[PDB]
């Protein structure tokens, strides 16, 4: 066959059926979605790397990730993001 | 084998359609050649780095992924072709 | 004697893959040492970000009475949210178009 | 008498028409010829994916339509309605190229 | 300590001085208010970024190196402060 | 009769002066007071290194002066010599903020 | 018993530290491994840029007859070279100021 | 008792000497040069990391370094820069 | 137990033969004693001059679409720079010819 | 086989592959190159002997031939060649 190629199609498709069970996707739109995921992912990853370099910490942790999303994502979207992410932290710490 | 003039291949009505999508309702006659010039500049700046990306990959066929890298380095990042 | 193979995304209760992004940060070269909770954090952030943009897109698709999402609706949704436009002002969408916009002096009397 | 609209009304109609539509404005084969032409100016004999050419043409049209909306803002700011190349030169100088 | 009206602490002739550095030949009297507003927006953004940096740093004191980082991530890099 | 220059001549003189000079055109104490006042709004009881304050001083002066040649280009672009707030609004919106 | 100590900057024959740049790139986390010639090459291109910009600094200083440099002269040097301006459009120098520049319509007559 | 803060000051002062033995230096301009070399260093380093990530190379090599040199530096600066870099890496290769 | 035979041309990091130039000075009958740094200095200046004249050879070859140098390229390179002309005013290049140069009074109206 | 005729061909070949890897060589222009290198060598070596004579100095060193190249070859190329020569004598001083 062919070597496996990663995509974010199935996860966004679960997100869609959570948010709108009725609708479908175009593949062009899903290409934009994959580009969006990778772009925001690398932006926050670069923030994570630079902030970890700045305070001379050999680890990356979530604390600077709240720092990163609060600096990068503006305002109420960022504070919403803090809300779901920290509660996701609570479920992950409770396993 | 070689080509010498295709900047006129971007015709005036295509520029007019772009200007209508730009919201221009009235276009001077002097617009078209200088828009061709700035298009020339922007395409040079992107394709120089694009073929630079390609030649570092030791490829003689370009990839669209490298075009994505060229535009995102230039600050005009594109969605819809990564992957 | 091994326990059941359970997934960390379900442990957070979210849908983005924890292990995939954990591997991505391990190979993306942003730190040599990675904490456990940060990939969970970012996965939740991105999944929510998809949630509001998909809500805006689906509402736009319902407004334009199409039941399968199209890039035009993505452009119209993102350019109509102020904070996402501040997030995404410098990005270009393939086959997207722009907002319907005419200036007042361009309109006739 | 054959009908003829007053000027600008039809122009506003293409503004509405191509602003509602997204489909691409330029003939793709001449611009393919042009990108091959300008690519040969750096290095000889490049091959192109059609995906790459279409991707770069969305990027190009986005850049152009951005600078047209800037020169719209400039020309309206100049109490005029017609764009002239000094307005575009102003916009290009303001953006910082 | 706690103050109220420091937007007017940037005086009008100081704004005239910046404008003459900008090469402005004639300044309207209306100008000083929106220059205060634009300065307000810009400083608000960059100092929000800076306080975010230092609250990550577990420092109660503002450092210049954080200001350097905050300016350069916004695309307005400065030199001369150890960056 | 006492000497009195025509308008613009004096202004051109300090234009040449402040183009020649590099010193900071904002008084330091109310500026840093404004910085402390606004920084109070996001978190309480902040202390400032002085060099940070002077750094963000020239950052502010550079941002304003940059949008000032933007404003000047807009003003001469509209065949005027006096700037108006919509010039600055235009310049910022072209820069995209 | 052991070779005499001689630095890698001497081997490159250039003044920027090969060892410090090597160490900074190893702990700057840009790849898992680093090639030998890459930090040397990086230091060389840096010192070339410093060479030309201090040439501009020096002759701009002799324009003002000052043997010690001022950052004003640095801003003059950056703004009077078009490629260095293109490198440095979005960065401003502390106490840098602006070029002597007047619009022609602002002049009398 | 103190702990060091490094800079590029000695190298800038030396290269100032062999470009022009008879001229001086101000300290704040010398810090500007410090931060300038730091900024160019970080730009090249990040671009190099990105190129190494693109071609899935886990090792960074001088080939993509000079590729990035053309990528960032425009024209004249780029071609002379690759010239000294090439002749320098040949001297190191002989060394 | 001898160290490896390594060359002074490599020690000066230059292409021109330091040893042969030293030998040609020694039997060129200019002094009975000669310093070590002098042939290195000569190697340096002759590298730089041959380098600049070869850059001129390269672009004078390239703009006439030739990938192999000709003495016409050499003549057009040298005679178009006044400083090498003051270096080489009394110098003739074989098959070099002259610059394309017509006096203005010789041209018709 | 015939006895060796020493010439300066291969060195100019090497320096051109630093300055232009692509471009080729005609042999009569190559003899012209040998004529430049020999002639300028002759001028500078004779001036070096002469300047050693006038200061009554027995030894040809770098400083008087620096003096001589400042004499004969003019201006910008002279001061640049001074720069590479100082660089070369310093790095050769470091062996």
Residue numbers in the entry:
A (entry chain D), H (entry chain H), J (entry chain N): 30 to 124
B (entry chain F), E (entry chain B): 20 to 102
C (entry chain C), G (entry chain G), I (entry chain M): 10 to 118
D (entry chain E), F (entry chain A): 37 to 133
What does the paper say about this structure?
Here, we report cryo-EM structures of human H1-containing tetranucleosome arrays with four physiologically relevant NRLs. The structures show a zig-zag arrangement of nucleosomes, with nucleosomes 1 and 3 forming a stack. H1 binding to stacked nucleosomes depends on the NRL, whereas H1 always binds to the non-stacked nucleosomes 2 and 4. H1 contacts DNA with L1, the amino-terminal part of α2 together with L3, and α3 to stabilize the nucleosome and contribute to chromatin compaction.
